[PDB]
Amino acid sequence: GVQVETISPGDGRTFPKRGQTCVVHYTGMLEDGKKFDSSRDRNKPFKFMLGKQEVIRGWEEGVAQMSVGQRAKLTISPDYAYGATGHPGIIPPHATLVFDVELLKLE
Ligand SMILES: CC[C@H]1C(=O)C[C@H](O)[C@@H](C)[C@@H](/C(C)=C/[C@@H]2CC[C@@H](O)[C@H](OC)C2)OC(=O)[C@@H]2CCCCN2C(=O)C(=O)[C@]2(O)O[C@H]([C@@H](OC)C[C@@H](C)C[C@@]3(C)O[C@H]13)[C@@H](OC)C[C@H]2C
């Protein structure tokens, strides 16, 4: 599944709801912490709408448990990420992933 570990607290009150657009900054790492992507590197917050099947399962479930302003480390098992397929050249088959995510706002 997904483990959610707080890096910095949010407001503890305002959580994503289906149909809202989550605006986040993230860094994606392989299991050992090696970075493969970051929205921070491109100076571009990432937006996705909850309930629209736009993201891997670990994000859909993990980000929903974050409150606005929170930073969290999401450790996502392969079944909740890219599974057996992986994503050739970026994500190995059967990879556990770690994302640092900051929930900036809901739009
Ligand atoms: C069409 C191009 C469109 C896109 O990729 C949309 C797509 O849905 C994205 C949002 C989705 C993802 C790749 C789903 C798969 C669909 C196939 C299905 O089999 C898979 O199931 C297991 C899941 O991403 C995710 O769920 C997760 C969680 C949210 C953050 C991104 N995610 C990551 O894992 C990353 O960090 C990663 O580096 O992000 C980059 C990134 O581009 C720099 C994507 C956007 C920022 C840019 C966008 C919108 O422009 C693309 C990505 O590039 C191709 C490779 C991955 C490894």
The ranges assigned to domains in the chain are 1-107
Structure tokens of 88?
């050739």
Q: Is 99 a catalytic residue?
A: yes
Residues with CB under 6 A from ligand 1: 26, 28, 36-37, 46, 54-56, 59, 82-83, 87, 90-91
Q: What is the rounded CA–CA span in Å between residue 97 and residue 36?
A: 10
Please give the torsion angle defined by the CA atoms of residues 85, 91, 96 and 99, in that order, rounded to the nearest 10 degrees. -130
Tokens of 51: 């309930």
Q: Are 42 and 28 in contact (CB under 8 A)?
A: no
d(CA 100, CA 59): 11
Residue 24 C-beta-side C-alpha neighbours within 13 Å: 30
CA of 66 to the centre of ligand 1 (A): 20
Tell me, what DSSP letter sits at residue 103?
E
Using CA of residue 4, residue 19, residue 53, residue 88, what is the dihedral sign? negative
Spatial distance between the Cα atoms of 56 and 70, rounded to a whole number of angstroms: 20
User: To what resolution in angstroms was this structure determined?
Assistant: 1.1
What CA–CA distances, in Å, run from 78 to 19, 27, 75?
26, 17, 10
Which two structure tokens, joined as six digits, stand for 12? 């503890």
Length of the chain: 107
Query: Residue 76, SS3?
Result: strand
Q: Rounded to an integer, what distance in angstroms lies between the CA atom of residue 4 and that of residue 91?
A: 20
d(CA 104, CA 24): 5
Beta-bridge partners for 48:
22
Among 15, 46, 80, 82, which one carries the catalytic annotation? 82
Ligand 1: residue of 24, 55, 85, 94 to mutate (most ligand atoms within 8 A of CB) is 55
Q: What are phi and psi of 24, to 5 degrees?
A: -135, 160
Distance CA 29, CA 63 (A): 16
Instruction: Compute CA distances 28 → 15, 17, 89, 107, whole Å.
Output: 22, 23, 14, 23
C-alpha 49 – ligand 1 centre gap (Å): 13
Cβ pair 55, 1 in contact under 8 A: no
